[PDB]
Design a protein around this ligand. Structure first.
Ligand SMILES: CC(=O)N[C@H]1[C@@H](O[C@H]2[C@@H](O)[C@@H](CO)O[C@@H](O)[C@@H]2O[C@@H]2O[C@@H](C)[C@@H](O)[C@@H](O)[C@@H]2O)O[C@H](CO)[C@H](O)[C@@H]1O
Lengths: 315, 315
């Protein structure tokens, strides 16, 4: 077969697969009460992308489409209805066996970013060039108007008027607007991709430890905020570079569980070991929550294929 | 000898190494009069990063640092000085043999994006959490105040007051503010990294065809605009995924030129051939400017190492 490998990129050379951020730390939270079932950063060890996962770092939490309607807020701000396409610009076919267009955000929150437009029509007197505009925007993924699987979403602006209808529109994500209670930030709560009364479909499966004393290991990034108090984070199961690597290699999985070692390349010693599961997630034997304190030169190296009964050395 | 390879990611699966954008099209411009000497997306075929190149898609045209104070400036908007560090947070050492902190923009223009801050100090009443803010911002890289090699740059905001002194600060690039004449957009004009009148140092070398009938081949992306007319583009020599791949493989270069073929896998046929040069750039035999019209599912396949005499089939 084709032997299994991971990239040799270090922690400071990896990026988050659920938001466009660098990886900051490795992280555990054994007492997590939520089901973990994120939809971006999902890839099996033999290279099958799942959920809404696509390969571009620029596509994570991105949208493309056109604005169709302006609707003022009751109190403050303006909302804009947007039809969405696939990120490559082709029409999104809701019968496609995916939860939503690839790259769609996979958590509840107010996602802050920039909406930009480049008009289709050009002006001969301007050298056959189009008009443009961009503004700060927020997409509330818990909104009843957040229906990307039906091909449409809503975003809000503080801008009151300068958003054009019928013109190509791009959303570049930047961070969150708020993590106040009213902003419903919960990184493990999936949006209702078709609206509140409708079941999500075609999901990548939930992940969990199955061996006693094990917990999930995450690649954690801190996410910027537009305002208010907080130090919010987004935890992914594998960095985007691992998704890209696994997709290209398509190495056969020889068992359900690979043993991997986090190594310090200077010393060559194993700092700790982890189980890398077939569905594309890590567990470790750790009985505590918080960051993993590790040498900056550390990375994961594949050791061998094991099974669910393998006992990891405690962290 | 570790065999040289390229990723099998397709054009719609690649991103630009000079700005955080997807690759839109392959592109030539044989009569370009400028010297081509970009500093991001620079990597030799045997995996040596050059210029200001680093590995993170999130690091391209990003800055990290601290705002010092608001500063006076004749130009429109409110202006702020910020110290800059390495992207990993360590102090930037100007004695390092690099032109500027890795990730620094490599072109003249008004770069539009978002400045965000997460305060160092936390508040007990807020659950021991820090205050945050973010605002749109512009960095004019041709400004005499743009001195990233000296550890200091300036940015402007529309916001008049809500940027805090002495707090951790991130710049997330989004596009350009303008491409009007007065905004000095020129993708091949390097910033003066240490200020007006100082010579840049430690640069990746210029690149050019050296064979009659040949021209540079670029991976082109269109860049968003905050306002104004235009359809500006940023051309890179190799996409970021190629930089990431070459860096990791570190395969010995067996000649100065790798012959590659652009293949349509669905049909299995070669669309055209190109030379991939040791310093990390492509040439083709083409006598016109403009996009290359071909499926976005096409990709470059390494064929063989060739010598200084090899003649490319015309596109
Ligand atoms: C949307 C807007 O106009 N923002 C300005 C406003 O921001 C503050 C309000 O949004 C407020 C509503 O209760 O929430 C605050 O969180 C927010 O301020 C932001 O967060 C606080 C904790 C501080 O870090 C502020 O610096 C930050 O902006 O009001 C502020 C000034 O208080 C600014 O004008 C915002 O532009």
């Amino acid at each position: 077969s084709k032997p299994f490998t991971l990239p040799i990129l270090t922690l400071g050379e990896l990026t988050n697969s659920r938001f466009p951020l660098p990886i900051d730390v490795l992280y555990t939270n054994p007492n997590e009460s939520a089901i973990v079932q994120c939809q971006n950063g999902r890839c099996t060890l033999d290279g099958e992308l799942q959920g809404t996962t696509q390969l571009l770092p620029t596509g994570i939490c991105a949208f493309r489409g056109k604005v169709t309607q302006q609707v003022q807020d009751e109190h403050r701000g303006t909302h804009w209805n947007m039809t969405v396409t696939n990120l490559n610009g082709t029409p999104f076919d809701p019968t496609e066996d995916v939860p939503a267009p690839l790259g769609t955000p996979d958590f509840s929150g107010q996602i802050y970013g920039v909406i930009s437009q480049r008009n289709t029509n050009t002006v001969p007197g301007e050298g056959n060039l189009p008009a443009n505009r961009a503004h700060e925007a927020v997409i509330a993924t818990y909104s009843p108007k957040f229906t990307p699987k039906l091909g449409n979403i809503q975003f809000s602006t503080w801008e009151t008027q300068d958003v054009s209808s019928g013109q190509p529109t791009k959303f570049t994500p930047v961070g969150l607007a708020s993590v106040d209670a009213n902003s419903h930030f919960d990184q493990w709560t999936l949006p209702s991709y078709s609206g509140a009364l409708t079941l999500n479909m075609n999901l990548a499966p939930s992940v969990a430890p199955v061996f006693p004393g094990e917990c999930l290991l995450f690649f954690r990034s801190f996410i910027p905020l537009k305002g208010g108090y907080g130090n919010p984070a987004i935890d992914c199961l594998m960095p985007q570079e691992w998704v890209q690597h696994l997709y290209q290699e398509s190495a056969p999985s020889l068992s359900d569980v690979a043993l991997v070692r986090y190594v310090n390349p200077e010393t060559g010693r194993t700092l700790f070991e982890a189980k890398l599961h077939r569905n594309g997630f890590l567990t470790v034997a750790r009985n505590s929550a918080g960051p993993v304190v590790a040498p900056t030169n550390g990375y994961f190296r594949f050791d061998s294929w094991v099974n669910q009964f393998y006992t990891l050395a405690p962290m």
